[PDB]
Every structure is written in structure tokens, then in C-alpha cells.
Short mmCIF file of C-alpha atoms in Angstrom, two decimals:
data_model
loop_
_atom_site.label_atom_id
_atom_site.label_comp_id
_atom_site.label_asym_id
_atom_site.label_seq_id
_atom_site.Cartn_x
_atom_site.Cartn_y
_atom_site.Cartn_z
CA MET G 1 86.55 -151.88 -12.92
CA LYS G 2 83.58 -149.88 -11.62
CA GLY G 3 82.30 -148.81 -15.03
CA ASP G 4 81.66 -152.45 -15.89
CA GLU G 5 78.78 -152.51 -13.42
CA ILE G 6 77.29 -149.59 -15.34
CA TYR G 7 76.81 -151.22 -18.76
CA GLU G 8 75.20 -154.12 -16.89
CA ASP G 9 72.30 -152.10 -15.47
CA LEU G 10 72.66 -149.09 -17.77
CA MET G 11 71.59 -151.51 -20.50
CA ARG G 12 69.35 -154.58 -20.61
CA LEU G 13 72.08 -157.08 -19.74
CA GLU G 14 72.27 -157.80 -16.04
CA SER G 15 68.75 -159.21 -16.06
CA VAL G 16 68.68 -162.49 -17.99
CA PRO G 17 65.27 -164.11 -18.65
CA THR G 18 66.00 -167.83 -18.80
CA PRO G 19 63.87 -169.39 -21.59
CA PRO G 20 63.42 -173.02 -22.75
CA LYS G 21 67.06 -173.75 -23.62
CA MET G 22 69.52 -171.05 -24.68
CA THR G 23 70.23 -168.10 -22.37
CA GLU G 24 72.14 -164.80 -22.52
CA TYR G 25 74.57 -166.61 -20.21
CA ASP G 26 75.88 -168.10 -23.46
CA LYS G 27 77.20 -164.58 -24.23
CA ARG G 28 80.61 -166.10 -23.50
CA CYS G 29 80.31 -167.68 -26.94
CA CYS G 30 78.36 -164.80 -28.49
CA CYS G 31 81.06 -162.36 -27.23
CA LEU G 32 81.69 -161.16 -30.79
CA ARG G 33 78.01 -160.63 -31.59
CA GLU G 34 77.87 -159.06 -28.14
CA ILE G 35 80.46 -156.45 -29.09
CA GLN G 36 78.05 -155.13 -31.72
CA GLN G 37 74.81 -156.04 -29.95
CA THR G 38 75.72 -154.40 -26.65
CA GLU G 39 77.11 -151.38 -28.51
CA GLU G 40 73.85 -151.09 -30.45
CA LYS G 41 71.49 -150.47 -27.53
CA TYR G 42 74.15 -148.28 -25.91
CA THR G 43 74.27 -146.23 -29.11
CA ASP G 44 70.58 -145.45 -28.65
CA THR G 45 71.42 -143.78 -25.34
CA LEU G 46 74.82 -142.54 -26.50
CA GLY G 47 73.16 -140.27 -29.04
CA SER G 48 70.35 -139.39 -26.65
CA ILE G 49 72.78 -137.09 -24.85
CA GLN G 50 73.20 -135.19 -28.12
CA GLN G 51 69.78 -133.54 -28.33
CA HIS G 52 67.63 -135.23 -25.67
CA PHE G 53 69.75 -133.74 -22.87
CA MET G 54 72.10 -130.92 -23.88
CA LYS G 55 69.17 -128.83 -25.10
CA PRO G 56 67.02 -129.24 -21.94
CA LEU G 57 70.16 -129.13 -19.77
CA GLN G 58 71.20 -125.72 -21.11
CA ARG G 59 67.98 -124.42 -19.53
CA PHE G 60 69.94 -124.20 -16.27
CA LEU G 61 73.60 -125.15 -16.74
CA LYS G 62 75.50 -122.16 -18.15
CA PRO G 63 76.52 -122.36 -21.85
CA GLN G 64 80.22 -121.77 -21.18
CA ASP G 65 80.37 -124.41 -18.44
CA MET G 66 78.08 -126.73 -20.38
CA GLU G 67 81.00 -127.39 -22.72
CA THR G 68 82.88 -128.86 -19.75
CA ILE G 69 79.96 -130.91 -18.44
CA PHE G 70 79.17 -133.02 -21.51
CA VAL G 71 82.57 -132.41 -23.12
CA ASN G 72 82.78 -133.99 -26.62
CA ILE G 73 79.71 -136.24 -26.46
CA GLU G 74 78.63 -134.99 -29.89
CA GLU G 75 81.65 -136.29 -31.82
CA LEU G 76 81.88 -139.21 -29.40
CA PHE G 77 78.42 -140.40 -30.42
CA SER G 78 79.96 -141.18 -33.81
CA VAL G 79 82.69 -143.42 -32.39
CA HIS G 80 79.81 -145.57 -31.18
CA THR G 81 77.33 -145.30 -34.05
CA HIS G 82 80.05 -145.53 -36.70
CA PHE G 83 81.78 -148.43 -34.93
CA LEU G 84 78.68 -150.58 -35.46
CA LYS G 85 78.40 -149.43 -39.08
CA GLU G 86 81.78 -151.08 -39.68
CA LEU G 87 81.46 -154.32 -37.72
CA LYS G 88 78.23 -154.89 -39.63
CA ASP G 89 80.06 -155.26 -42.94
CA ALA G 90 83.14 -156.58 -41.14
CA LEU G 91 81.30 -159.41 -39.42
CA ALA G 92 79.05 -160.45 -42.30
CA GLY G 93 81.75 -159.38 -44.75
CA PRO G 94 83.76 -161.97 -46.74
CA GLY G 95 85.80 -162.56 -43.60
CA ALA G 96 85.02 -161.61 -40.01
CA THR G 97 88.70 -162.04 -39.17
CA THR G 98 89.14 -158.70 -40.94
CA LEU G 99 87.49 -157.07 -37.90
CA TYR G 100 91.04 -156.05 -36.97
CA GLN G 101 91.06 -153.43 -39.73
CA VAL G 102 88.26 -151.81 -37.73
CA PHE G 103 90.23 -151.87 -34.47
CA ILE G 104 93.61 -150.86 -35.92
CA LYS G 105 92.45 -147.63 -37.58
CA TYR G 106 89.94 -146.64 -34.88
CA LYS G 107 92.76 -145.59 -32.54
CA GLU G 108 92.24 -142.04 -33.82
CA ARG G 109 88.90 -141.91 -32.00
CA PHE G 110 89.63 -144.54 -29.36
CA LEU G 111 92.39 -142.12 -28.39
CA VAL G 112 89.72 -139.46 -27.86
CA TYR G 113 88.91 -141.47 -24.75
CA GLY G 114 92.18 -140.10 -23.41
CA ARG G 115 91.57 -136.36 -23.63
CA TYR G 116 87.92 -137.23 -23.01
CA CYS G 117 88.72 -138.72 -19.60
CA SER G 118 90.74 -135.55 -18.88
CA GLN G 119 87.82 -133.12 -18.98
CA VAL G 120 85.32 -135.83 -18.16
CA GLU G 121 87.03 -136.75 -14.87
CA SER G 122 86.54 -133.06 -14.09
CA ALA G 123 83.09 -132.78 -15.65
CA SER G 124 81.42 -135.69 -13.86
CA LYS G 125 82.92 -134.28 -10.67
CA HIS G 126 81.36 -130.89 -11.39
CA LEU G 127 77.86 -132.34 -11.71
CA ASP G 128 78.18 -133.78 -8.21
CA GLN G 129 78.52 -130.20 -6.97
CA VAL G 130 76.29 -128.50 -9.53
CA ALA G 131 73.27 -130.72 -8.88
CA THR G 132 73.62 -130.40 -5.11
CA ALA G 133 74.20 -126.68 -5.65
CA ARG G 134 71.23 -125.73 -7.83
CA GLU G 135 68.16 -127.80 -6.97
CA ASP G 136 66.77 -126.78 -10.35
CA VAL G 137 69.45 -129.05 -11.81
CA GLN G 138 69.08 -131.97 -9.41
CA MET G 139 65.45 -132.48 -10.42
CA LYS G 140 66.35 -131.86 -14.06
CA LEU G 141 68.91 -134.66 -14.38
CA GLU G 142 66.27 -136.89 -12.80
CA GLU G 143 63.58 -136.29 -15.42
CA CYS G 144 65.90 -135.37 -18.30
CA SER G 145 67.69 -138.68 -17.74
CA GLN G 146 64.36 -140.51 -17.40
CA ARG G 147 64.67 -141.04 -21.16
CA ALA G 148 67.93 -142.94 -20.65
CA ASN G 149 67.97 -143.96 -16.99
CA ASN G 150 65.94 -142.34 -14.20
CA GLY G 151 68.85 -140.90 -12.22
CA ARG G 152 70.74 -144.20 -12.40
CA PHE G 153 73.90 -143.40 -14.37
CA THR G 154 73.17 -139.88 -15.65
CA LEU G 155 76.10 -137.94 -17.18
CA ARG G 156 78.32 -138.20 -14.08
CA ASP G 157 78.12 -141.97 -14.56
CA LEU G 158 77.61 -141.86 -18.33
CA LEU G 159 80.64 -139.98 -19.70
CA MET G 160 82.68 -142.18 -17.34
CA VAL G 161 81.30 -145.36 -18.93
CA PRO G 162 83.47 -145.21 -22.12
CA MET G 163 86.47 -145.21 -19.78
CA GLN G 164 85.92 -148.96 -19.46
CA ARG G 165 85.12 -149.58 -23.13
CA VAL G 166 88.58 -149.03 -24.60
CA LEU G 167 89.84 -151.29 -21.80
CA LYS G 168 87.38 -154.18 -22.04
CA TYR G 169 87.70 -153.74 -25.81
CA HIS G 170 91.12 -155.32 -26.31
CA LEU G 171 90.42 -157.48 -23.27
CA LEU G 172 87.22 -158.97 -24.67
CA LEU G 173 88.90 -159.20 -28.06
CA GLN G 174 91.34 -161.53 -26.30
CA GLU G 175 88.60 -163.89 -25.15
CA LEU G 176 88.10 -164.62 -28.84
CA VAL G 177 91.73 -165.15 -29.85
CA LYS G 178 91.97 -167.55 -26.91
CA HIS G 179 88.68 -169.21 -27.87
CA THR G 180 88.78 -168.84 -31.65
CA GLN G 181 90.16 -171.87 -33.49
CA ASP G 182 90.29 -170.43 -37.01
CA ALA G 183 92.84 -170.05 -39.81
CA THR G 184 93.44 -166.31 -40.13
CA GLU G 185 91.14 -165.12 -37.35
CA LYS G 186 92.99 -166.75 -34.44
CA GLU G 187 96.07 -165.03 -35.88
CA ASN G 188 95.06 -161.74 -37.53
CA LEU G 189 92.64 -161.12 -34.66
CA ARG G 190 95.78 -160.99 -32.52
CA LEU G 191 97.02 -157.99 -34.49
CA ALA G 192 93.94 -156.12 -33.30
CA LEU G 193 94.99 -156.85 -29.72
CA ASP G 194 98.41 -155.23 -30.07
CA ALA G 195 96.75 -152.07 -31.40
CA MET G 196 93.82 -151.85 -28.99
CA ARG G 197 96.00 -152.89 -26.05
CA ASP G 198 98.32 -150.07 -27.12
CA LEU G 199 95.71 -147.55 -25.99
CA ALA G 200 95.14 -149.01 -22.52
CA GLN G 201 98.61 -147.67 -21.69
CA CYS G 202 98.11 -144.35 -23.48
CA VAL G 203 94.59 -143.74 -22.26
CA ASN G 204 95.50 -144.46 -18.63
CA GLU G 205 98.58 -142.25 -18.89
CA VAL G 206 97.67 -138.61 -19.43
CA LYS G 207 100.32 -136.19 -18.25
CA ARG G 208 100.48 -137.85 -14.84
#
């Protein structure tokens, strides 16, 4: 809901330079290519939190608490980088319709979003206090994030981003099945929905 607005600005998307015929607005048709394209750029920033952040961040934020701030960004960076590594061969592969195989077995990690949103929801909340608490941190996140987004969606808004992914995932995937007149795709692609959609109810249902 709110996270959607993030990806828009967080990544070169919201702004669409209208050229002589053909415009990003066509994304509605490129949706598929968008799944990988959008993920790509995001991956660049997704991994940025790995080194270009945690290291400089530790300069102020305690080591013990630091584990709660970022959470599992490290292993989470794979879910993004690896995801594209699959779609690449899945899309260009003998049959794009097989993309499902990439969505059916990814639950393992896509589920991470669950426990992730459990410490995250508490982590992002901590930053709000931490930053305001230690000025040394407030200014840090500003510059440290300058590499990703000058205090626009830093951590507090970042770790929360993926919370919309898993959701829009199956959702977007539906836009295709409903607008994909193929032989196996229109069908098999549906199988991916059942799986992905299966998380939306597990991810948004943690304990209580």
C-alpha cells in the first residue's frame, strides 16, 4: 500500500521521460520485463546495504543492536540478486511460461519476508528513535544513504520495502495471466499465482 510509493521514487520509475513514440507508460505490457528490470536496479541498492552501510553504520550504532536494525539484509540481498539470475534463463529459456518454477520454489526465501517483517517492523521503528536520539546517527544516515537515496527511504523505509514485494509479486503475476493469451503460459503461469498468493496470507499473519 504505502511501500509501493517507495519503489517509485526509490528507483528511477516515477519519472518518465516521454520520447518520440514509446514510453515507460507501456510498462503495463512490459510488466514481465519489468519484474526483472525493476528488480535489477533495486538489487544495486539492495546489496549496497551489505557493505556500503553496515560498516559505516557500526561506527555509531552498537554491534549487538545493529543486528536488529538491518536484520537479515545480508542473506536477503541474495533473494533479490539470485531471483534475477533465474528469471534471466527462465525468460529467455526455452519457455518463459516456466517462470513458475522460479516462483514455486522461492517460497523458502519469500517466506523470509515473514520473520523479516517481524524484526524489521521493530527495527525501522528503532531508527526513528535512534536517529533522533544520537545526532551522530541522524547525520550519518543522511550521508551514508547518499549512495542509495539522500535520506529519502533510508533503512527505516528500505527494509520495509520488501514488505510490498511479496504482495505485488503474485498480484503483478496476475496481470499477466489475465493479459497473457498463450498455450501453457496462460495456464501454468496460474500455478505460480497459487503459490505466491499462498504467502500473502502467511506473511501477513505472524503470531497475531
